[PDB]
């Protein structure tokens, strides 16, 4: 199973945007027409589909200090990887 | 800003405790709130985070709830070790910042007890040194709210008194207070009647204890 | 055990700068932030700033911006805080606490240090004067005490009859007098008829001045 | 929190005993409660665990019941060795913790007996020491409740007496009580009439025993 | 026959530490927990902590966290408890007790030690003063006794007429006076008609202090 | 017969769980969605069927101290072993 394609299906189900514009290299903010409240609804749906909690506060803190890039958390191919890590950490 | 209510909860062991924390704005920062317990001389201890998640090793009688502007910490049934101070805490980004509430004290409720009041003139020892300390003692009272007023020859004193208070006695759960009036030796030898007037809800009216310098 | 331990010189002159160290152990240093929180006597907790060992980034509370510097040495597993231009209002217990950088479990200030004191004072070390609070004697109960005046720094300790007297003792918290010196009183209630059967002595210790005074309190 | 009611049960030998222990909060899904028996000078002894299970070697007359917040220990017929103190106990996990109730004393019921009252002046031997101990004895009374007041030259005393009571006598099941008034020799010599006044439900009115210092 | 035996120094100074040993026998040490429970004078049972010989783990009651350390030596079948920074409120009888780790049978504190006393006090060992409670001059039954005053530590023993008089004797529990010393009285009722024909002597022994006193109690 | 199959039958008779979703490698709580109270009714039925008393609290306490794993008590293949040991202990 592709975690990205799972994530893209959730984004398409929530936002009024076509599935074909949702690509692995797309930034969830900045590249897709998605604002902060739309993303919180997407996060909630991600959190439930995968049984995890996206650590949105701590991720944004990490980027603020430069110890992480926006791309490693919010470009979709990388978001899929972060999700897999969270799911694995749940063990 | 966080606002905690009430400042003091007076409850008995076994009773349910509900503490409130209100934010300045609805918590934009993912509805996050943390609760900490602190006992005297001890570091704070994390009880709750993410409004509702219990920290490791915290008993199940502690629960957190709320969202947006209003949160509560609930202690379903108070154990003796739960009488302490509790702080709430919020966090935000842009820029990173954390703030604490001012704290709520959970104390042991008991019956009203009026203070025993005692006044002490300055020692002759101290008077040889050129200063005079007059002391008023309010012994073993409940609740904690008490007012002390000093008069020197019926003139109301202002700004020359300091007080401090014990924590709840481990046996009878009362408080004690001392107030110290500081005067110059010259000032003390130049007046006669020294009086401490104590207001407390255990009394039908404020009680005054006094002495006359030189008896 | 995860542990954080604060350390530093307690007594600092006004206008000086104090450096506090937070030595941590038992966990991966780069996986947690270091927060600094202080507590003035009798007051609540006040957040001061956050330090990130991964990259050295910081964020300070508005009240301290310009006066505070947070640093770290990851090879030493130690965070540092420098607070400059000290005043009386900076007298407090100073804490460091950890906060996970990369985890959702115990997502809060989960472990704290014991705290270390910073006292901003021009005063020099001074031993107390000990004065009796003579019983001028509550239904067959008398009150007596000892006033422990004008010492620096804290603490003093008080026992009664070398510790044999325990019941009815109330030793009040010290207050800071306008002079910059501390004072406290200790009181005890006894059966009034014991004033003629029993000696009552307060034993006052102030270790910074090596002061150990026994003062008898007489009717 | 565990509350045991009442704190004292007064029953005759052979009677059925019902002891209550209630939890401030429901006792999980486990509903675990343990009961312990303690005699003076002896260690507690486990009677019941898991609310209803007798420990090995415990006589069948002991049975336990209850669930949720309400629990009971039953002794079907009291044997002489059963007059003792009984404690209930609960337990929890995460964190591990055990708590006790404050205990119920099962006491031997008997007919009312009025106290015989005696007053002792201080010995001359002690008076040399500068201390005067005056003793008032309440001998072989039942039930336990009794009031003792001291009067010195008809003035009521307070704060300078202390009282001690024996456990129930092995033969007649009565109580004995001493009240000891402690004074300086000087204060002892400033007054003449020393009187001990005893209130007990076996007496139609309080009884006074007195002496005149020096008679 | 399964048993646990507490032992340790009873009389400790305020601020000191006490170490209590719990030596067990008659059962497999590693199949049971060791709980520590204390009982202050006249008060109820207070749980202090649990020790697990299987790995050495512990859980302490929050009231004693930081002040207590529980250990054990399996090859000695012995548990230990250290309690630090003692105060008068730690004066109690300290019990150790077993509780099976692996079984729902006898699932509780099913065996306890005899308990061992810890008295937290600064007082020096002192024998008692013994004073007669003389039978009054003013038929029937007469009461007499002895006042046993100002001794430390507990206990004293009292007999009458070297054990020849037992009926009617009531020896009261000891009271810790505000002075730090203990006091009690022992009394007895006899026929009035016996005051001129039978002598009455209390035999007071205080083992800690090299003291034995026989006091004749004259009408 | 195997002690596991006795336990699986008891679980299927007591809770809303089909017998063929009960496997030896299943964790009784995490893998089959059994609540606290349903597990107590199951424990009661196990206790009667085998003449033992499952020491549930003491097993939890054992896990708390790290002296034992959650798997050695509540994975069903292991729970069968624990039951057999309890049956031998009462002997
Ligand atoms: C952050 O915190 C870390 C950890 O404490 C500090 O790192 C230490 O820094 C000190 C000082 O720079 C280092 O001390 C130096 O270590 C060298 C290596 O010592 C070992 O190896 C030599 C042979 O290779 C042995 O002889 C020796 O016994 C040791 O086994 C020494 O060779 C150095 O000695 C030279 O310099 C000193 C002056 O510093 C002279 O006194 C000597 O005579 C000699 O000329 C020196 O002792 C230490 O090794 C570091 N420890 C670790 C664990 O890294 C950081 O300094 C600190 N950073 C900041 C910014 O505060
Ligand atoms: C827990 O309790 C156990 C049992 O009570 C206890 O075990 C004992 O430990 C001592 C000290 O380690 C052992 O004594 C040793 O015995 C060997 C064999 O005879 C000797 O060779 C040793 O001698 C050397 O060490 C001595 C100092 O200890 C020197 O004086 C000497 O010159 C040698 O250098 C030593 O005497 C003893 O045999 C065991 N006993 C048993 C039954 O195991 C253990 O120490 C306790 N542990 C703790 C942490 O309290």
Residue numbers in the entry:
A (entry chain B), F (entry chain A): 2 to 92
B (entry chain L), D (entry chain Y): 3 to 27, 27A, 27B, 28 to 95, 95A, 95B, 96 to 213
C (entry chain H), E (entry chain X): 1 to 52, 52A, 53 to 82, 82A, 82B, 82C, 83 to 100, 100A, ...
From the reporting publication:
Other regions in the spike S2 subunit, such as the stem helix and the segment encompassing residues 815-823 adjacent to the fusion peptide, are highly conserved across sarbecoviruses and are recognized by broadly reactive antibodies, providing hope that vaccines targeting these epitopes could offer protection against both current and emergent viruses. Here we employ computational modeling to design scaffolded immunogens that display the spike 815-823 peptide and the stem helix epitopes without the distracting and immunodominant receptor binding domain. Unlike peptide-based immunogens that can sample diverse epitope conformations, epitope scaffolds are meant to present only the antibody-bound conformation of the target epitope on their surface, which typically leads to higher antibody affinity and the elicitation of antibodies specific for the structure of the target epitope.
